[PDB]
Amino acid sequence: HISSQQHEKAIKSYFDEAQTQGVIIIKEGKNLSTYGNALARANKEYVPASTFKMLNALIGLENHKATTNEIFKWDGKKRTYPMWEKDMTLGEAMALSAVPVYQELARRTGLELMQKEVKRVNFGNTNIGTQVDNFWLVGPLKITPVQEVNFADDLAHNRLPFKLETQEEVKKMLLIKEVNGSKIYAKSGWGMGVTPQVGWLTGWVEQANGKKIPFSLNLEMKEGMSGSIRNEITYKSLENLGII
Numbered sequence: 188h189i190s191s192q193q194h195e196k197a198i199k200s201y202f203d204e205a206q207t208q209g210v211i212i213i214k215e216g217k218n219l220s221t222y223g224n225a226l227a228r229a230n231k232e233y234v235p236a237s238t239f240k241m242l243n244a245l246i247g248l249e250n251h252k253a254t255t256n257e258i259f260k261w262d263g264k265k266r267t268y269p270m271w272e273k274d275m276t277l278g279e280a281m282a283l284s285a286v287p288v289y290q291e292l293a294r295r296t297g298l299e300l301m302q303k304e305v306k307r308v309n310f311g312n313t314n315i316g317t318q319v320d321n322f323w324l325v326g327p328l329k330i331t332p333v334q335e336v337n338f339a340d341d342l343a344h345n346r347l348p349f350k351l352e353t354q355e356e357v358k359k360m361l362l363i364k365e366v367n368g369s370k371i372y373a374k375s376g377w378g379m380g381v382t383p384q385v386g387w388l389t390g391w392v393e394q395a396n397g398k399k400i401p402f403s404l405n406l407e408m409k410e411g412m413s414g415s416i417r418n419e420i421t422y423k424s425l426e427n428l429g430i431i
């Protein structure tokens with residue numbers, strides 16, 4: 188079959204072609220595999236950006252700050268994108284990366300409860316600072332790609348410290364693709380308020396046989412770069428390895 192050298196070269200070429208620097212961590216059982224064109228990013232800390240939504244939702248639901256069918260009403264003020272100027276549930280806001288909805292959720296949770304829950308979960312450096320509505324966007328909260336793939340592994344297998352119903356609700360919110368009997372659950376992320384800008388795509392693959400293969404793509408986003416580049420490189424890498 189295909190050599191490890193060829194797989195590594197192919198995935199590295201996906202990041203090279205996009206003219207960026209990035210890594211993608213794959214986890215099978217307890218083993219971590221690092222691929223990409225800048226392997227040292229694996230243990231470097233970056234803001235989680237939208238990937239934090241997964242945990243924001245978990246906390247919000249567990250602590251009764253919202254329900255899965257509650258509709259967060261658009262307040263009528265201009266948003267960064269027209270697509271965000273509407274009423275939506277947590278799940279809809281997850282799919283649209285609707286930051287305003289999640290900022291409202293964070294405000295309901297409150298700084299004190301948020302700091303305690305982020306600590307309880309041991310997410311990244313666990314520090315949210317003093318601003319409850321933007322700590323995952325501009326710091327001080329940071330996390331490495333290894334910690335992100337492990338967070339995905341824990342959520343996929345319901346190991347996080349939340350009722351299993353809560354975990355299942357948030358997981359249902361993350362289905363972004365189906366391919367050849369395989370289901371891909373993930374959350375993209377783009378930290379535009381930091382320099383350099385970081386891009387993320389963290390989730391897992393649920394294969395027909397029921398096995399789950401967690402992953403975390405992390406790269407530098409550059410001016411005039413497409414968010415869908417995080418997805419194409421992720422899908423191409425997963426396919427090259429025979430995961431999907």
Ligand SMILES: C[C@](COC(=O)NCCN)([C@@H](Nc1c(C=O)cc2ccccn12)C(=O)O)S(=O)O
Pocket residue numbers: 235236237238267282283284286324375376377378379414415
């Ligand atoms: C790039 C995504 C979504 O991805 C899409 O390209 N849009 C898609 C919906 N079809 C999204 N970024 C994001 C955040 C999450 O990090 C957080 C902010 C804050 C301000 C401005 C943009 N902010 C975006 O600006 O649209 S990020 O991957 O969540």
